[PDB]
Design a protein around this ligand. Sequence first.
Ligand SMILES: *[C@@H]1O[C@H](CO)[C@@H](O[C@@H]2O[C@H](CO)[C@@H](O[C@@H]3O[C@H](CO)[C@@H](O)[C@H](O)[C@@H]3O)[C@H](O)[C@H]2NC(C)=O)[C@H](O)[C@H]1NC(C)=O
Ligand SMILES: *[C@@H]1O[C@H](CO)[C@@H](O[C@@H]2O[C@H](CO)[C@@H](O)[C@H](O)[C@H]2NC(C)=O)[C@H](O)[C@H]1NC(C)=O
Ligand SMILES: *[C@@H]1O[C@H](CO)[C@@H](O)[C@H](O)[C@H]1NC(C)=O
Ligand SMILES: *[C@@H]1O[C@H](CO)[C@@H](O)[C@H](O)[C@H]1NC(C)=O
Ligand SMILES: *[C@@H]1O[C@H](CO)[C@@H](O)[C@H](O)[C@H]1NC(C)=O
Ligand SMILES: *[C@@H]1O[C@H](CO)[C@@H](O)[C@H](O)[C@H]1NC(C)=O
Ligand SMILES: *[C@@H]1O[C@H](CO)[C@@H](O)[C@H](O)[C@H]1NC(C)=O
Ligand SMILES: *[C@@H]1O[C@H](CO)[C@@H](O)[C@H](O)[C@H]1NC(C)=O
Ligand SMILES: *[C@@H]1O[C@H](CO)[C@@H](O)[C@H](O)[C@H]1NC(C)=O
Lengths: 582, 195
Amino acid sequence: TEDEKAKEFLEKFDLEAEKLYHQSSLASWNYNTNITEENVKKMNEADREWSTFYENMTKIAKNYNLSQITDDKVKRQLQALQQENKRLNNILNEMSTIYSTGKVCKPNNPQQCLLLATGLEDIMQYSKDYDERLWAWEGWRSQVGKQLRPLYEKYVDLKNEMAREKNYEDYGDYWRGDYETDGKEDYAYSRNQLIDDVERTFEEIKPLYEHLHAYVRTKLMDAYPSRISPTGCLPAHLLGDMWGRFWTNLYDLTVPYGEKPTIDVTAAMINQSWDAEKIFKEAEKFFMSVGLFNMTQGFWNNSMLTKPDREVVCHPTAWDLGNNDFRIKMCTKVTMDDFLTAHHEMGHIQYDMAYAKQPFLLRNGANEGFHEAVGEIMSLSAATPKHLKDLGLLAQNYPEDYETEINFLLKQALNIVGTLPFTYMLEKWRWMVFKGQIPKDQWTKKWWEMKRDIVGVVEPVPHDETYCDAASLFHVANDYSFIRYYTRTIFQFQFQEALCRTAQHTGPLHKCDISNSTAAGEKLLKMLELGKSQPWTFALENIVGERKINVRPLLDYFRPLFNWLKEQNSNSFVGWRTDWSP
Amino acid sequence: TKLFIGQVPQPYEFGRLVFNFTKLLSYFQVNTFQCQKVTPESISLTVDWFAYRVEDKSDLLPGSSSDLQRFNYKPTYSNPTCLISAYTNLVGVNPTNYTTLTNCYGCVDKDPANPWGDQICIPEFVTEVEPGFRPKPSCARVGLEGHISGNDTYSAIVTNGELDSTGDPIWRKGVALTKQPIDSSRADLAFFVSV
Ligand SMILES: *[C@@H]1O[C@H](CO)[C@@H](O[C@@H]2O[C@H](CO)[C@@H](O[C@@H]3O[C@H](CO)[C@@H](O)[C@H](O)[C@@H]3O)[C@H](O)[C@H]2NC(C)=O)[C@H](O)[C@H]1NC(C)=O
Ligand SMILES: *[C@@H]1O[C@H](CO)[C@@H](O[C@@H]2O[C@H](CO)[C@@H](O)[C@H](O)[C@H]2NC(C)=O)[C@H](O)[C@H]1NC(C)=O
Ligand SMILES: *[C@@H]1O[C@H](CO)[C@@H](O)[C@H](O)[C@H]1NC(C)=O
Ligand SMILES: *[C@@H]1O[C@H](CO)[C@@H](O)[C@H](O)[C@H]1NC(C)=O
Ligand SMILES: *[C@@H]1O[C@H](CO)[C@@H](O)[C@H](O)[C@H]1NC(C)=O
Ligand SMILES: *[C@@H]1O[C@H](CO)[C@@H](O)[C@H](O)[C@H]1NC(C)=O
Ligand SMILES: *[C@@H]1O[C@H](CO)[C@@H](O)[C@H](O)[C@H]1NC(C)=O
Ligand SMILES: *[C@@H]1O[C@H](CO)[C@@H](O)[C@H](O)[C@H]1NC(C)=O
Ligand SMILES: *[C@@H]1O[C@H](CO)[C@@H](O)[C@H](O)[C@H]1NC(C)=O
């Protein structure tokens, strides 16, 4: 009989929820595409009304006995709602502020200080001076990282108390609940299962990373003579980044064939008189050819595809306003990055439209990594030489070249492969901290031991337990989970392989375009339409062919590069020793 | 009759010429006659022809997955087309053996400072024949060498007059396999006839 009550409750919830959601989202849109004092006020009051509504109906949902609900979709909708605070909010607000306003002052003039986004990021990206790079690196951690120590310690204790009140072992266990699902046979997924799968896939990547690491090492040894040992770890500050999250900026130092330029169609689009409207129209027909949705009349009216000439946020985003109202906000230029971004952002819209028929509470991605992975795969297809050629942007008789393929694959690897050990190590450290596996007074010690053993990166400067390197990163200081980036990358390749298989593509995986492939489109759509109505393992199977997490497709994608690296390292040490430091 | 005069080309260097079927059937003994998008009774016209054994005839058939149609010769057959597989004594001259390309893939230079030096070859960079076209000349040359080396499966890294986007030589690693005939006193030929 409670199955019936739950249903009428959810029906009433949806009727009010959609009305309040739409007006709240509209107010936010209006602010972002205008920015006025009047608009921020309207946004704030609109958000307030939705928030009070949602919380009031959460309390009601929690009065239902979930164990006696028969209809699984009703069960999941109830769960969407059902699933020391003052002190914690004070800690969280202070941590965010310290990060945001952090600056590094010059040693010979304390009155002149650089902020992260005003100069320090440019030093880490462009500087080739060992000592200038070290100043920015150590300065950031000394000035900001040492302020977040006592706050991160209080943060961890308070978060664990919260998680345990909700019957979790700790806050790390709480976070891993985002992958937990019910289901028959092996569709169910446990919270501790994520750990086994993450470690399992990591061990299969190592060989690729060790060769990539060795290659980069020999290039940096020339850039920085007598600074780097041929058998040791790489200095943290020489990776082209404040944290070493990506190796993207090392491309200019590592490029295999510097005389072999990559494809760039910026000039082609300029000569052919392209604009933002043209770019999005071309993206639209791409999605139609694979067999997905076309854009609605509202999309083409109320979107902001160009920067107005107001004060606006030009950051590319895909919006779902509610009531079949979809928009994109993006200050589009005619380059090549914005061309490919248009496909990324429209890919989000395709997903949002696909599950528009689901119950309000189930209108989301099956998993936190699914929504972004879909965007990425559509973007990759549109970047292939044959797509650019068929668009009339790349010369029809453009000469083939194998060296440029190696240059391309390495650039991709520096961003995609060189980041995976970072995500793995960072999240693993936090999990151990929350569990209590790492003692309060061994946080720094383990951070650097793990980083040297797992990533192969060594601290330029001796640090004691007054530093907090983890909290020197945005996501840690601002209380965000990080594992989503690890799983997203793996799913991205599982999706692309399955679609290129469906499309009957024979050749290197990096040269696959799913255009004119309705079969690939139909297979993709089947997964997109599910939203959160099913376990992500079920949704995964519908597009991949298997319900398990599989890193192999990633390793196959970069296989041509792996073979190249192996021969390049014939006379080099592969791997690293941790007994060396600068 | 011109196509029966002189020697018979290998699959990777198939002959092509452009211009009475019953008379042709009086030159050779046909084993298999099949047509795609055309009635055999009905068959400008063009013929693509090369030496190929009868025993491995399966490889000549449309829709088949084989090395022949991947690295040597693939018929697009956009025009209506017929396949004739037959054997005959040309004494032209009969083939001593049959050579087929089994693989070909691209190579990059180990040392960027020397485009003519040692190469690193990547198996994944597969170079396959485009329908109607001959194999690339850095692929076909390996087949030509394999047909004479004596090794029943010859492999080599070659370049043959084709340049990249900068003007440097394109190197490719090819693999050719040579098959010995069962009947040493006859030629086995494949003919692809299109309107
Ligand atoms: C397939 O048939 C061809 C002939 O149509 C065979 O080619 C012949 O192979 C022999 C043995 O290697 C060659 O003789 C050698 O010539 C070199 C000089 O290049 C000499 O140094 C050696 O001492 C020996 O005399 C012969 O010249 C060559 N025929 C031609 C026209 O070049 C081929 O070996 C056969 N393949 C297989 C697997 O049986
Ligand atoms: C940006 O916001 C301002 C408000 O700060 C909008 O200006 C109002 O426009 C309405 C008409 O729609 C007038 O009735 C109000 O009197 C105007 N108020 C002010 C203070 O000027 C402006 O139109 C908005 N711009 C866009 C593109 O929406
Ligand atoms: C919460 O919802 C119930 C529905 O019965 C309503 O009576 C109550 O007034 C609501 N409370 C608030 C603060 O909106
Ligand atoms: C109601 O909830 C309790 C847990 O508080 C559970 O033990 C009980 O079995 C539930 N009732 C039914 C009919 O499932
Ligand atoms: C395109 O390039 C050609 C030169 O090849 C030039 O003559 C022409 O004016 C250019 N058109 C535009 C729109 O830039
Ligand atoms: C695009 O969608 C609209 C929906 O109103 C439809 O009328 C139009 O025919 C569609 N065009 C194509 C090519 O599907
Ligand atoms: C879009 O704008 C045009 C202005 O030409 C208007 O006629 C049309 O009704 C609008 N459509 C929508 C969905 O707003
Ligand atoms: C898809 O096919 C159309 C012709 O029907 C062609 O114009 C377009 O470029 C193709 N897209 C690809 C292969 O990317
Ligand atoms: C010839 O055959 C031998 C034995 O298999 C092999 O070692 C050699 O590399 C081959 N040479 C060529 C050119 O294939």
